[model samples]
Target chain A: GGFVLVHAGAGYHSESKAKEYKHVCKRACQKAIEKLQAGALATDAVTAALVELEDSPFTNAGMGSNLNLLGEIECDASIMDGKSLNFGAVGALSGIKNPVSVANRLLCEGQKGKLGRIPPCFLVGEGAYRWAVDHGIPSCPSVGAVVVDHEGNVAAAVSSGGLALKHPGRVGQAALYGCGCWAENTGAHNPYSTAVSTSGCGEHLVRTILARECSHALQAEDAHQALLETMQNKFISSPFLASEDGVLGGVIVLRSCLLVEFLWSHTTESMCVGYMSAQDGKAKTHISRLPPGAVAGQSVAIEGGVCRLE
Target chain B: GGFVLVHAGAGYHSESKAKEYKHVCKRACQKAIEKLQAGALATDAVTAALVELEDSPFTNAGMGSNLNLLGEIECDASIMDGKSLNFGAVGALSGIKNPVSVANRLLCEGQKGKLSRIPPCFLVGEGAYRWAVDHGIPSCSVGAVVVDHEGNVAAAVSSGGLALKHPGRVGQAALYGCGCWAENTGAHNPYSTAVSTSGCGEHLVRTILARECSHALQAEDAHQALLETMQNKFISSPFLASEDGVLGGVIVLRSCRCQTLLVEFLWSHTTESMCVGYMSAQDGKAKTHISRLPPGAVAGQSVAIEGGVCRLE
Candidate 1:
């Protein structure tokens, strides 16, 4: 059965607000599942999931996303189609709402239309916003996704309004390939291959090359253990991070197989995750939280139509 | 002996202006060699070389760089210290003359004072220009190093950005692990590599993936490895293969334990022409040679640099 998995972003949040975040994740997963059931491509499923996250004010994505030091909503988003390795992204964008849709259009039109020219994969600032306007794509609030369709295709997308009070032209990991989101069906041929999307402190993810590093590590014998090692070695053990207590980053992974594998992990205090697969017929959501005084390593595994945290 | 290599972008230029572009490359190579001979680190040498390239009016960097669609001059620059994997960069910046100097300062200060914190390595737009003002680092106009000392390699790069780009837009020059990379495994390991690039900013960054390319140089044949990298990974890449013109150019230095230093630089563009220059430490008295290819022609056809001598052993 194909599946969808997602995260709102990794960070410290009030316990009282946990329910709201979880609810949002559940809704996002449901939205994606609907698309998958309707025969939507994996790329469309991930985009649908991210659009939900972007619309949620509780998340730091599209609407109500954090403002820059200048007090304006400049957003970043990207989408990757694993089968074709086509990627599109926009950064420091304003006015337009759903930046992910614009990215998707760019991927579809830019790559297919241009014969001998490189398709536009990344855009930023006024140029990007202007392109969105010209193309009739509406703007909205932002955040991030990974999903596999019934056809066994894999895809990933990520979006963010960026860190609060960040520099006016600051572009985050959300718009970078091999960082914010990456997807590939290589895992179908080799079980270690996977599609991945990430959210958290943009800088930490970029420096660690989280999405690419994690996907590469999936080459290990045990897919579950491979992800754990990446989290421990690449994020938790990174010397570049300022804090040792926890590193704010989370990821959703979809690996292709007869029985698809969905995995997620985070170093933040807690991360909101929700997922649904064809076999389950119903959506299930979980909050992977670390108890007070516990180490910053925890993961969620969805296998054989069952979900659990470890 | 250490070596320096340089490029004046990888796009088409008028055949009549070939002499001027070649002259600039020769001077840039000489400027970097001066630093190399003084025992300066690879990072510093690359910076010095770029200063020369940026100062030239013929090139699209620094003083005479291309303006954005809004008729403003916003520059991007970055520097990487291969020794420690430390990096610094600035993007969409204006009002400063020498963007590379600011990037270098960020590299030196960011890595030195923060034992408990990671210093900010990337700055952008007006805020970045402000940081330059606060730190008293002078700014100049724009763009785009590799050096090896005692088997340790370090590299740096800068750029004015693409012509007629959107204002406040940043290209690959301002991105770390993209435009350039320099590293060495203490001369004890089999790999010592440094890389620098010039070309279509967006295409070069995405296609070349310079930092990743340097890391992929573990193969025993340095020359073959470089060719394979540029052709297989960069030129033939799915995303880059579609670009119409010559996409970009690269300068690479790979020195192994045997004291054999291989300097390989190449330009791949659909454009009509490109220019390059090179000089070696052993041949200080030898004049730096400049080459300009005809329309749709190729560079770096040779496996090894000619008439170059190395004696670090």
Candidate 2:
């Protein structure tokens, strides 16, 4: 019916930083759109988008985050999916460049098996870094993502190396649940509204936000509502905690045909997503109708005879 | 039962800047009073009160907290219960304001459920933040509390927020739960005692406050020794942590009966919670006690407490 767009956050910072910011943002958005062209689910599109962003050295993520006194890499990230009503996340995971990617992977794993009996997702610190490396996921030092689907499902993710040059192992709110990543695959108030949050140290992404909420929120509507209500009512009123270093991060939501975005930052930074589209005389067009895998800056036909980036 | 009061440590700064210093100290004490009146449990009240102080921006808590150039909130906090002797905390939670509140919340949560059920209630990064949000709690910024059956309990907390914050939310030790919450349940001590540890990061807070609280909770004699005989010892150390950009801010008490032994000092800084626009506290003097180091530490800082307690026999 329409188009939904997510942004990394807009603001007036140093002009010199614009090029890097635009590149990463464009790259991230393009990757998500490509996933949609492939007919991937919104969740998949979100994951694909983040994979590209995390690898970028620009921005506050990956190789660029501030360093602690100890002089080590501690990253943070989050994701969300509205479909499937499932959420997962990780936090304070070290050595891994793509913390958000791990979160999405954990979401998929939850769908693959039963986590109620076993422990949630992956580990943080060296353990998580080792796992990502072993799985053949190269460590890029920085990361981010973007995604768009023919069905108009859109998702985004962001990662950070955290403020660098401080304490060696100090972490940020990138790995906690409800802080970093969230998604609503099912739709808000439809059946189940899914959200993923990540908080605390960026190094422990997998443990904090990636694994915990992803599977649990996806399980059932009751579970989704329980998590959402708790976050909306109880948590925000008091202390927002993080696992790695005790900070706030990001949250992703999957609402009814709409994307829900959440953020809790040390500074005043925030993220917002709205609809972006063009119209013609007769009928309004939305979402790329072309086959999935359409790269960035490419024109494609609209699916369901909606919108075209002609 | 007499009163027992304690300060994390005292130091002197510039008189003009002392304005900032006084704000956090006074707010911290007032927070303690508010929690005492709220009818909450000692631990919860202490957490609530300290969180407020931390969030004040005048005391190194939530917004405008100092940052480390790295743009992260490296905070330290702790909590203690004299009777149950339980403790909870976290260190260096970036992008958060009042880290102490989160630490205290985790401590309280730990008290209820099994420690193993959800991993000892200790979290970092997403783990802590996730729990906070999932529980409907805000990120790091919060007030400290001290509650009691009679609505008379002591509370304390602190934080340094970020090392290089732009404006407010400096995050004092009073905000990060670095303070201790002890109920003088036994005959010898007062009804409650809480400490708002400042001037240090996780490591320092752990050593000066957490460890000392644990040691003091062992026995009445030990508590007396630590508070009395060891009084001079803490004075000398004043446990400062540079790595964490913190020095010290502690409040201790047994119950309504407290020790006005030494007054705490505050400094005016450009951090978030301590700015001139947000200043709310000033003056530092103990009800019955004076500081050996009136200068506190450097230039012209003062130490003060509201209540008093007789020396141990």
Candidate 3:
């Protein structure tokens, strides 16, 4: 049995459009579950979910993404496979709608690259744009799967659009490995291999490597305590983040194999999240939030559940 | 007191030109020490070290950098200021004499970006070239990690790309997590550290080997962490896929938390050979060496680690 969890973004979402946000997540999770049923790898399934999210109007990726300083719909996305520990990412991308799809392909491509001369695991800006088209072509897809501003995606799968109004050549955490997302399935001997994706301030996540650190921490005997401390020490209270007036970030995690679980943490007021298993009849969604009246970025929230996988 | 270390590159240096390679490393070390002695911060010293290394026709960055498919001197570079946790990088860049200088500026710019806005932490290809020109000037593989009098740490990396690489190709030297990393939690944090990687760019980038080692250095037993990082994250990483022979290396430097202690430095590699050099203000001169694994060990399989410790009274 396979499971997937997705996040719309880290900051507050509209109650007015709560259903809209939830629906998009539901659809995205639905797509991921379908992919899992189709025997897709964890990496491929995340892309499927990410593609669905990017197609939505309310999410910050793809169609609804913010136009940056130059008003270009530049996008960034990344994918990692727990099974292979391979990663691929694209940044400052345009001309494609589903950045996550290319990211997944790049992950696979890099593995193939192992067969030949080594190729870049991360590509950015115009060069990234060209490489995406070159590889995705013969023909191209205006297809996209992430919204930059609505919620920074940290899909056990993830994507970004730089923060909106970003500098012309800017790239967010979505393109950097160990920053945006991390997936690894250490052999069967290690039952706790995990995947993680991040949201919130790109710079903060980049500095702390929140996604990879979280995944690594999960290997600890105490998943919650280990993961929580990292979020505090390596990120919120870490030296690299000392200058931030406040740290605003979020993470979505999914453990594969021996143990199956879903986890998320955010420093924002609210994080809209959704999760599901291929065997489950319906996907479940929620808005993980800090205690009411608590200041966003100053407070934190975390919640999760183990899928019976019955 | 200040400390600095530099590496020409992590590869089999030709014995014939070993003297030439060693000479450049000494200059790189001396240049970095001079910057530190000048009261410059670690951020500034590593840049100085890189500039010297990049200028040397004997090194693999800048002047002596490898030519890509077009036989042009496209380059990649990055710098990190542990004090601010800011990073700046350029990839597949060209027409720049010193990529390290441009990267240094970008790190400063990244710091300024903390205020309500963020500039690109990384830039590449013609755009990076244009940005360099638009900002001030233009800017190969050389790496340096340094500790200044302030005890802050910084890392700088530059490369000329692998020989005959694709025109717009970038190397690990410029990629975040893969290239260089420097950080100090505060005045007396054990985690205060700087790391730089050399050798196979793709393998390093794929594993983000630098940051992995940087994180490992935080372990109570630093040597074991280095060993695990090289074996699990570098050689045996699933990301490496099916590669039979993997060549990689990293230079690590850390400042102790006692406030009385100065710093510690080490080098680890999974390659045939690595040309490295180090200098502390107390040493009065640089020390150079060619590091390699013992006989009967495979370049891709066996790992080698060696280091030194220095303190200021």
Best by DockQ: 3
lDDT tens per residue, model 1, B1-313 = 4676666766656676777777787777777778877888777777887878877887777767898777888778888776766777877778887788778877887667644433567776666787888889775522225555466666667787777765555677877667777666643346666666666676665653676567666676655666677666666665554554335666666665554544443333333345666667766642433333443445322111222324453
Off by over 4 Å in 3: A138-155, A186-189, A257-259, B69-73, B185-191, B218-229, B237-241, B257-262, B311-313
Writing each residue's lDDT as its tens digit, candidate 3 over B215-300 gives: 78888777778888899878987667567878988898888657575577898899877888898886797899898888988888
For model 3, state the Cα shift of residue B238 in Å. Answer: 5.4
> Model 3, range A1-310, lDDT digits (tens) per residue?
5677788866864667677767888888888777667766666667888888888877778778888666877777888766556778877777777878777777788777547577567766566677777775322341112111101112356777667776555667777778888877756345566778888788788877787788778877766677778877778887777777888888887664434666888888878888776667598878887887878877668888676454
Q: What value does the lDDT take at residue B217 in candidate 3? A: 87
What tens-digit string does per-residue lDDT give for candidate 1 at A158-178?
A: 989888877666778887667
State fnat for each of the candidate structures: 0.25, 0.03, 0.33
Give all candidates' CA lDDT scores: 0.69, 0.40, 0.76
- Report the Cα lDDT for residue B206, model 3: 72
Q: What interface Cα RMSD is found for model 3?
A: 2.4
Clashes of each: 29, 262, 20
User: Which candidate order results from sorting by lDDT in descending order?
Assistant: 3, 1, 2
TM-score of model 3, chain A? 0.90
i-RMS of candidate 2: 16.9
How would you order the candidates by DockQ, starting with the best? 3, 1, 2
Q: How high a TM-score does candidate 3 get? A: 0.90
